[PDB]
Ligand binder design. Structure first.
Ligand code: BEF
Ligand SMILES: [Mn+2]
Length: 130
């Protein structure tokens, strides 16, 4: 998948407020193909629905937390290379390490600015040649 306007995003967070910030930011960046999920399980259900080219995910969520969601994606042969950008309030280095090692594409700490989100998505695009 390429970082054109068609790229389909899944935005995962247990708080709609954060999902809403991220969707609106993506729109501003020219990405309108965006769906939401409320937790890791819901997210896996949509991911299984097919078509997604990028995940942005919270960490602390009921049902399945985002570290589990990230690991699950990375271990699944059908989606193991799916970009996953963590966006979370967890700021300790051990958290950043656990997610990095689990294969996170990137990591943004809440609260974040619009410029930061844009910068970190662009870094992932460049890295993967999207
Ligand atoms: F709830 Be998230 F991890 F900020
Ligand atoms: Mn949360």
């Amino acid at each position: 998948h390429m970082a054109d306007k068609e790229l389909k995003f899944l935005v995962v967070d247990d708080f709609s407020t954060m999902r809403r910030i991220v969707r609106n930011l993506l729109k501003e960046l020219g990405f309108n193909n965006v769906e939401e999920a409320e937790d890791g399980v819901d997210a896996l259900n949509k991911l299984q629905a097919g078509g997604y080219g990028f995940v942005i995910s919270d960490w602390d969520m009921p049902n399945m937390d985002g570290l589990e969601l990230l690991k699950t994606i990375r271990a699944d042969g059908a989606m193991s290379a799916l970009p996953v950008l963590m966006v979370t309030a967890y700021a300790k280095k051990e958290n950043i390490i656990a997610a990095a090692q689990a294969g996170a594409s990137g990591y943004v700490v809440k609260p974040f600015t619009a410029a930061t989100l844009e910068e970190k998505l662009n870094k992932i695009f460049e890295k993967l040649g999207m």
